[PDB]
Amino acid sequence: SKWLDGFRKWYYNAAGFNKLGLMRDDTLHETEDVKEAIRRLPEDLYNDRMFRIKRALDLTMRHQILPKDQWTKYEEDKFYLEPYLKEVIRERKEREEWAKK
Amino acid sequence: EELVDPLTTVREHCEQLEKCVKARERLELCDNRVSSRSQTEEDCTEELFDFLHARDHCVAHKLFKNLK
Amino acid sequence: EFGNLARIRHVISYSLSPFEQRAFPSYFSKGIPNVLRRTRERILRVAPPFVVVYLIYTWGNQEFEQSKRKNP
Amino acid sequence: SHTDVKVPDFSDYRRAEVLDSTKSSKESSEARKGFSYLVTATTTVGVAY
Amino acid sequence: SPTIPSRLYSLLFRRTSTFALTIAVGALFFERAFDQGADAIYEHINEGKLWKHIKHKYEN
Amino acid sequence: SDLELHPPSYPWSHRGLLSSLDHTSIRRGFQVYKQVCSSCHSMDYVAYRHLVGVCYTEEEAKALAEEVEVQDGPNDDGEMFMRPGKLSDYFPKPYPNPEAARAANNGALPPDLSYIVRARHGGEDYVFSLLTGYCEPPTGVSLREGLYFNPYFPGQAIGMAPPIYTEVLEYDDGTPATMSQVAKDVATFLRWASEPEHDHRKRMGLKMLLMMGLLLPLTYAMKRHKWSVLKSRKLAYRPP
Amino acid sequence: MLSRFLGPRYRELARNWIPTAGMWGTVGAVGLVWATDWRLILDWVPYINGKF
Amino acid sequence: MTNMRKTHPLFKIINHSFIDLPAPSNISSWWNFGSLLGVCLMVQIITGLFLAMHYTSDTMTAFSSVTHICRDVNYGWLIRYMHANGASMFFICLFLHVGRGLYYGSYTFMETWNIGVLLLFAVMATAFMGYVLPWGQMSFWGATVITNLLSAIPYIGTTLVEWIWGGFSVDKATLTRFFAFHFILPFIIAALAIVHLLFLHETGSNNPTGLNSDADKIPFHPYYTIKDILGILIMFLILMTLVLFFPDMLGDPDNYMPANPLNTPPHIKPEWYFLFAYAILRSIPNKLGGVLALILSILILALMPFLHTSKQRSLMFRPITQILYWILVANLLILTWIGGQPVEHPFIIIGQLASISYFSIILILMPISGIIEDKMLKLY
Amino acid sequence: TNMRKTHPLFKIINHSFIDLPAPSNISSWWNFGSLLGVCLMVQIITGLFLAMHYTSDTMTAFSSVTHICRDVNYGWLIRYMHANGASMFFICLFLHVGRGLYYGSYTF
Amino acid sequence: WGGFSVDKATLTRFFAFHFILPFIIAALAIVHLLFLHETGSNNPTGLNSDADKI
Ligand SMILES: CCCCCCCCCCCCCCCCCC(=O)OC[C@H](COP(=O)(O)OCCN)OC(=O)CCCCCCCCCCCCCCCCC
Ligand code: HEC
Ligand code: HEM
Numbered sequence A: 001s002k003w004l005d006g007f008r009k010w011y012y013n014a015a016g017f018n019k020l021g022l023m024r025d026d027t028l029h030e031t032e033d034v035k036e037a038i039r040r041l042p043e044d045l046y047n048d049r050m051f052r053i054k055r056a057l058d059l060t061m062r063h064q065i066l067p068k069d070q071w072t073k074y075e076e077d078k079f080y081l082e083p084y085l086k087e088v089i090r091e092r093k094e095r096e097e098w099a100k101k
Numbered sequence B: 001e002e003l004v005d006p007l008t009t010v011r012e013h014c015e016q017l018e019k020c021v022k023a024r025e026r027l028e029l030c031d032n033r034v035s036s037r038s039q040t041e042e043d044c045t046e047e048l049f050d051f052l053h054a055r056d057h058c059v060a061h062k063l064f065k066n067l068k
Numbered sequence C: 001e002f003g004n005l006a007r008i009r010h011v012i013s014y015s016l017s018p019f020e021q022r023a024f025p026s027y028f029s030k031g032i033p034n035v036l037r038r039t040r041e042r043i044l045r046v047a048p049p050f051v052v053v054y055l056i057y058t059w060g061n062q063e064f065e066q067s068k069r070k071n072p
Numbered sequence D: 001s002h003t004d005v006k007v008p009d010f011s012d013y014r015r016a017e018v019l020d021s022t023k024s025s026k027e028s029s030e031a032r033k034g035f036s037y038l039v040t041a042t043t044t045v046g047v048a049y
Numbered sequence E: 001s002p003t004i005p006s007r008l009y010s011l012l013f014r015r016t017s018t019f020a021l022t023i024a025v026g027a028l029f030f031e032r033a034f035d036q037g038a039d040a041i042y043e044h045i046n047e048g049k050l051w052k053h054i055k056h057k058y059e060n
Numbered sequence F: 001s002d003l004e005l006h007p008p009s010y011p012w013s014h015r016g017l018l019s020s021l022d023h024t025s026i027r028r029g030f031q032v033y034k035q036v037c038s039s040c041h042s043m044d045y046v047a048y049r050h051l052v053g054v055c056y057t058e059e060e061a062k063a064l065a066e067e068v069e070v071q072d073g074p075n076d077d078g079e080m081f082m083r084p085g086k087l088s089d090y091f092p093k094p095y096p097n098p099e100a101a102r103a104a105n106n107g108a109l110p111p112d113l114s115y116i117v118r119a120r121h122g123g124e125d126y127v128f129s130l131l132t133g134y135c136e137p138p139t140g141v142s143l144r145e146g147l148y149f150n151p152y153f154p155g156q157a158i159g160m161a162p163p164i165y166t167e168v169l170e171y172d173d174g175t176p177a178t179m180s181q182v183a184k185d186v187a188t189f190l191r192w193a194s195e196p197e198h199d200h201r202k203r204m205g206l207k208m209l210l211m212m213g214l215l216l217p218l219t220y221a222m223k224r225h226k227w228s229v230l231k232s233r234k235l236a237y238r239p240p
Numbered sequence G: 001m002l003s004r005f006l007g008p009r010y011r012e013l014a015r016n017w018i019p020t021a022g023m024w025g026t027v028g029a030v031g032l033v034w035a036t037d038w039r040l041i042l043d044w045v046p047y048i049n050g051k052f
Numbered sequence H: 001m002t003n004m005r006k007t008h009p010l011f012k013i014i015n016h017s018f019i020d021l022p023a024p025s026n027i028s029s030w031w032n033f034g035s036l037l038g039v040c041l042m043v044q045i046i047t048g049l050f051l052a053m054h055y056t057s058d059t060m061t062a063f064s065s066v067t068h069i070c071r072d073v074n075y076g077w078l079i080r081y082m083h084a085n086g087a088s089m090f091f092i093c094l095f096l097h098v099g100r101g102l103y104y105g106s107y108t109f110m111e112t113w114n115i116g117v118l119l120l121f122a123v124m125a126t127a128f129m130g131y132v133l134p135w136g137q138m139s140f141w142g143a144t145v146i147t148n149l150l151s152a153i154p155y156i157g158t159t160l161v162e163w164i165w166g167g168f169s170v171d172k173a174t175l176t177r178f179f180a181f182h183f184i185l186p187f188i189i190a191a192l193a194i195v196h197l198l199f200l201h202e203t204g205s206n207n208p209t210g211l212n213s214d215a216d217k218i219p220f221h222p223y224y225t226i227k228d229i230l231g232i233l234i235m236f237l238i239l240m241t242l243v244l245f246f247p248d249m250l251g252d253p254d255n256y257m258p259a260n261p262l263n264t265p266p267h268i269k270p271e272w273y274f275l276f277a278y279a280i281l282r283s284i285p286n287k288l289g290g291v292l293a294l295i296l297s298i299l300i301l302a303l304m305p306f307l308h309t310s311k312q313r314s315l316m317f318r319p320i321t322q323i324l325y326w327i328l329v330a331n332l333l334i335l336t337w338i339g340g341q342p343v344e345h346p347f348i349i350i351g352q353l354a355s356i357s358y359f360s361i362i363l364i365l366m367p368i369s370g371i372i373e374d375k376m377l378k379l380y
Numbered sequence I: 001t002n003m004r005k006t007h008p009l010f011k012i013i014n015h016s017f018i019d020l021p022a023p024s025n026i027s028s029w030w031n032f033g034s035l036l037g038v039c040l041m042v043q044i045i046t047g048l049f050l051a052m053h054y055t056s057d058t059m060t061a062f063s064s065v066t067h068i069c070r071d072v073n074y075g076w077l078i079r080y081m082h083a084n085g086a087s088m089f090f091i092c093l094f095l096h097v098g099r100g101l102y103y104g105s106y107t108f
Numbered sequence J: 001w002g003g004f005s006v007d008k009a010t011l012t013r014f015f016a017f018h019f020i021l022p023f024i025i026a027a028l029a030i031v032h033l034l035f036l037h038e039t040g041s042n043n044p045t046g047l048n049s050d051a052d053k054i
C-alpha cells in the first residue's frame, strides 16, 4: 500500500545517507560485480558519483552534514546502477551455470 | 573511668536516631522471640547487622573530629 | 600509493595556510549545536540498551540482597 | 571558463590581522609564525621535561 | 612597535638550531620553576603532615 | 553465617586525591605495633631502615633497632649466635615458623600485617571496624571458647582476642590513649606499611595532573593547527 | 551460499579426488600413530610389538 | 642527487608505511586505537624488561621478590603498577579495536582480521600467564581453576594438563615455565603485528562511511602522526592517573597474600577482561561444553566475515543492525558483571540468558537484520 | 593466479629464497651464513628450554643447573647443546667474517 | 653491577639481557639479509656474476 511507501521514505530519512547528498547506489559495497558495473558506467555518471563520494567524505571528516535544502530526497533518488548491475549478475550467473555442468 | 573513650560518646549519641531505634526495636523483638525458647535454631545476626550498619554509618559521620 | 588511486575530473579544491587561519574558528558557538545534533542523531540507537542493562543490574543486586534476608 | 572560478570567502576562518583585504601582508606574518611556533616550542618543552 | 611574538620569531624561532637552544634553555628554567611550584603546592595542601614539617620536635 | 557486614567509609586524612598521610599518626601507630601487635603478628617485608625520614630520625631508628635482639651467624666456631640489631634488620618474627604460631595462638594463624590493608576489602576502614567492633554475641548463637564475636570478621567468629582498650600504652607525645585513637593510629600505620610510596605517589600525581593539564590544550592546538588546512577546505564540481 | 558447486562437473571432480584424499588421510593417520606411539594401533601390528 | 627517503631501503619501507601512506581523510578517533595498542605493547615490553631485572621465578622467592621490587627498588612500584595497569589499558584498547572492526565492516579485510584473531588469542594467553607470575593467592588459584577446566577434553585432557603443569599440580616448574612463556610471547605478538600491518597496507584502510576512500586520501604525515601523538598522550593521561591515583581498583586485594595450596578463596574469579568468557563457561553445567563454548565464542568472532549478508559495509546507514550491535555491547557488559558475581540466585539464569542472547545476536539476528534492511532499501 | 608471486606473505619468501638469483659458482663458505641463522634458531630454542627450569637467584642458580642436568628428562642434552652450540655459533661466525675479508665482501 | 660488586641484581639483570638480546639479533639479521638482497651475493672470483646466475 501507500503505508509501505511512507514507511520506506521514513526509513530513508532515518538511515541518513541522504544527509550527505548521496544516492542509494553510492552506498553499495565495492564487490567485483559492483566494480564491473562502475566500469560500465558512462563518464558523466562516473564523475557525479565520484564527486558525491568525495563530498560525503569531506563532510564526514568535518563531522557535519549538508543544509536541508540540498539533501537527497526519496523521490529523486535515481537508480542509475540497477540495469548495469542486473546485467552483470545475469552474465555471471550464466557463466556459473555453464561452468557447473 | 577518669579518661573516657569518645567513641562510646558518639555511639550513644547515634543510638537515639529514628532508623537506629527502629532497628533496635526489631532487635529486641528478635531477642525475646528467640529467647522464648521454642527449640528452633534461628538467630539474630541480621537485625544486629542492621542496627550496627545504621549506628556505624552515623558514628563514621562524626567520630574523627574528637581524635587527635 | 599516491598518483594511481582513482580517476577524478572537474574537481577544484581551495585551502588556506595553517598560519593564515584561526585554530579554533567559532569553537563553542558552532560546536555546541553540532555536538547536540550528533547526540540527537545517536541517542535513540545507543542509550536504551544501556538503560535496560542498568535496570537489570539494579534488579539483580536488589534480588541478591533480598535472597540474603532470612524469610520469616 | 578558467576565469569564471574564484576562491570563496574565508572570512569565517582567517585571523583578525589578515582579515582586512586592502592591507598588505608581511607586516603580521612574523607575529603569526611566532605565536604558532611558540605553542610548538612550549609543548616541546613540556614533552622534553 | 614590533610585537613580542614578532621579536620571538625574528630572534629565536626563525632558525632551527636557535629554536632547539631556546627549547633546551626553556626546559631547564621550566623544570626548575615547575618543580618548585608543584612542590610548594604540595606542602601547602598537606601542611603539618609531611616529615619536613615535623622534623623539629625530634631532630634537635 | 553467609551474611556479610560492609564497613563504612571513615573520613581519613589521606582519603583525598592529593591528601598525604599524617606522619605523627604513623609514628604513634608504629609505637602501637611495637608495644601490642608484635607479640603475635609479623611484619616480614618492613625493615627498621624504612622508618628514617618517615617517622624517626636515623639515630632514633638506630636506637630502636638497638633494643632488638636478632639471630645471626654462623660464627667462626660454626654455630648460631645472637646480636643487637642494625638498621638493615627486618622486623622480628614472634615465631620461627607458622606451625608454632598456630600452636601458641589457639589453632588460628595470626597473619602477616604487611599487606593487610591491601589484602582486605575496605582497607583500613575494615581494620578500624574490626578493632573497635568487639561486641557480645546475639541471642541464640553459641560462641566457643577461644573465639570472640566480631561482626566485621567474615563468619563473625574471630580467633583474635580484643587487643586494645583504654590506655593500653603510654604515648610519647602526650596523646590521650583511648581505644579509638590507638585503632586510628595503628590503621594509619598499617596503611603506610603496605604502601610507603603513598606521599611520593600523590606528589607525582599532582605534578602529572598539572603537566598534563598544560600539555592537553597545546598538543590539541598543534593537531588543530595542522588539520585546519583540511577543515577549511572547500570543494567544487564543474562538469563541462 | 555454497550453491556454486552443485553440478555434475564438481561431482566428477569429487569422485576423482576420493582416492588421493583418502590416501593422504591414511598417511596422516599412520604418521600420527607413528609419532605419538599410540598404544591402540601399535599393539595390533606384529613387528612393532617388541618394546611392550 | 637522489632522495634518501625513497631510495634507501629501510627508509623506503618506513616511507611506505608511516610517511607517504595514503590514509582516508575522514577516519574518526576510533582509528587511533591501533597505534595505541602498538605503543601500549611497547610500554609493556619496556616495563616488563625493567621488571624482570629483579623478579625471580621461584615459589619460595617470588612474592618476596615482588615486595622487594615494590619497597626497595627505586620507582619499582611505578614500573610494576605501570605494567599491571598497562595490561588493563591494553585490553581496553583491544576491546575498542575489535568493536571498531565489528561496527565499520572492517572484517572484510579477511586475512588482516584473522591475523588479528591470532593476536588476540596470543595476548589473552600472555596476560593470563603474566597474572599467574606474582604468585599470590589469586594467581595460583586462578591458574589451578583454568587448568582443571582445561582437563575436561576426552582422552587427552589429563595428559595435557599434567604436561602443562610439569607435575601433578601447580608448583615451581609451572611458575618457571610460565615466566619463560610470558617473557617470550609478546615478541611473537610483535611479529604477528608486523604481519597485521603488512596485510593492512596491502589492502588499504577503511573509513567510517564504508565507501571507496581513494577519491579523497591524505598522507599519513603530518595529519595522522599528530592525531596519534594526541591519542597517545591522552592514553598516557588515563594510564598515569590510574597508576598514581587508583592503583588497586582493577585488581583484587587477595592477590596481596602469598599463595596457599591449602586455603582456597571464596571468590575465585579471573581478571576483569576474562570475566565475560568466565560467564560463558558457567552458562553450561558441562565442563567440555563450557570450554568448547568459550573457544567457539572467540572463533565466531573469527567467523564474522562469512556472516555478512548486507550489501553495505559499515553500519553508518543501517539503524536496525546498529540497535542489535549496541544490544550486543550491553550484553557483553552484563556478561562481565555476571562473571564478576558468585554462582547464586539470580545470576545463573541471567548468565544463561546473556550467553544465549550473545550467540543469537552474532549468529542469527544480524544477517537477518541485514536482509531486512536490504529489503527496506528496495535492494531485494 | 599463483600464490607464490601474488600472495603478499609468500611473495617475500619467493623473493628471498625461491626465485632469488644467486651466483652459480659460490663455494661452501657461503653456506656458513645460513648455518649462522640455523645456530641462532637452535640457540633460541634450546635457550627457551633452559628457561623453563632456570632460577635467576644467587642461592639457586648453580643448584638449578644441576637439577636441569640430573633430574630434568634429557636436560643434560639441552644444556650441553646450548653450550656447544654457542661454541659452534662462534666458529661459524669467525668463518663468516673470514669469508667477508678474503673475498672482498666488505664493499657492501 | 647494581651495587658495590657482582651480586644477585647483576645476575638477574644479566638473565634478562641474555634472554632478550637474541631477538634484537634476529631482527638485525633480518635487516642484514635485507641490505644484502638489494645487490646480490658475491662470488669467489669477485666478478659480475649477472652473466651466469641460478
Ligand atoms: C517507533 C519509531 C522509532 C522510535 C521512537 C522515536 C520516534 C522519533 C520521531 C521523530 C524523528 C526524530 C529524529 C530521528 C533520528 C533517526 C531515527 C531514530 O532515531 O529512530 C529511532 C531508533 C531507530 O529506529 P529504527 O531502527 O528505524 O526501528 C527499528 C525498525 N524495525 O531507535 C528506536 O527505535 C529505539 C530502539 C530501542 C531498542 C530497545 C531494546 C531493549 C532491549 C535491550 C536488551 C539489551 C540487553 C539484553 C540482555 C539479555 C540477557 C538478559
Ligand atoms: C595475640 C593475642 C594478638 C595480638 C596482640 C594482635 N593480634 Fe591480630 N590476630 C591474632 C590472631 C590469633 C588472628 C587470627 C584470627 C583468625 O580468626 O584466624 C589475628 C588476626 C588479625 C587480623 C586479620 C583479620 C582478617 O580478617 O584476616 C588483623 C587485621 C589483626 N589481627 C589486627 C591486629 C592489630 C592491628 C593488632 C595490634 C593492635 C593485633 N591484631 C594484635 C592475634 C593477635
Ligand atoms: C595485538 C593487538 C593489535 C594491534 C597492535 C593491532 C594493530 C593494528 C594497527 C596498528 C592497525 C592500523 C591502525 C588502525 O586501524 O587502528 C590495525 C588495524 C586493524 N586491525 Fe588490528 N591490532 C591488534 C588487534 C586486532 C584484532 C584483535 C583484530 C581483529 C578483531 C584486529 C583487526 C584489525 C582490522 C580489521 C584493522 C583495520 C581497520 C581499518 O582499516 O579501518 N586488530 N591494527
Ligand code: HEM
Residues within 6 Å of the ligand: H041, H044, H045, H046, H047, H048, H049, H051, H052, H055, H066, H080, H083, H084, H086, H087, H088, H090, H091, H123, H126, H127, H130, H131, H132, H133, H134, H182, H183, H184, H185, H186, H187
Ligand atoms: C615481553 C615483555 C614482558 C615482560 C618481560 C613481562 C614481564 C613481567 C613480569 C616480570 C611480571 C611480574 C611482575 C609482577 O607481577 O608484579 C609481569 C606481570 C604481568 N604482566 Fe607482563 N611482561 C611482559 C609483557 C606483558 C604483556 C604484553 C602483558 C599483557 C598486556 C603483560 C601482562 C602482565 C600482567 C597482567 C601481569 C601481572 C601484574 C601483577 O599482578 O602484578 N605482560 N610481567
Ligand code: HEM
Residues within 6 Å of the ligand: I029, I030, I031, I032, I033, I034, I036, I037, I040, I093, I096, I097, I100, I103, I105, I106, I108, J025, J029, J032, J033, J036, J040, J041, J042, J043
Ligand atoms: C649474527 C650472525 C650473522 C648472521 C646470522 C648472518 C647472516 C647472514 C646471511 C644469512 C647471509 C647471506 C648468506 C651468505 O651469503 O653467507 C650473510 C651474508 C653476509 N654477511 Fe652475515 N651474518 C652474520 C654475521 C656477519 C658479520 C659479523 C659480518 C661482518 C663481518 C657479516 C657480513 C656479511 C656479508 C658481507 C655478507 C655477504 C656475503 C657475500 O656476498 O659475500 N655477517 N650473513
Ligand code: HEM
Residues within 6 Å of the ligand: I040, I043, I044, I045, I046, I047, I048, I050, I051, I054, I065, I079, I082, I083, I086, I089, J018, J019, J020, J022, J023
Ligand atoms: C633467547 C635465547 C636464549 C636464552 C633464553 C638463553 C638462556 C640461557 C640460560 C637460561 C642459560 C643458563 C643455563 C645454562 O647455563 O645451562 C644460558 C647459558 C648460556 N648461553 Fe644462552 N640463551 C639464549 C641464547 C643464547 C645465545 C644466542 C648464545 C650465544 C651467543 C648463548 C650462549 C650461552 C652460553 C655460552 C651459556 C653458558 C653455558 C654454560 O653453562 O657454560 N645463549 N642461556
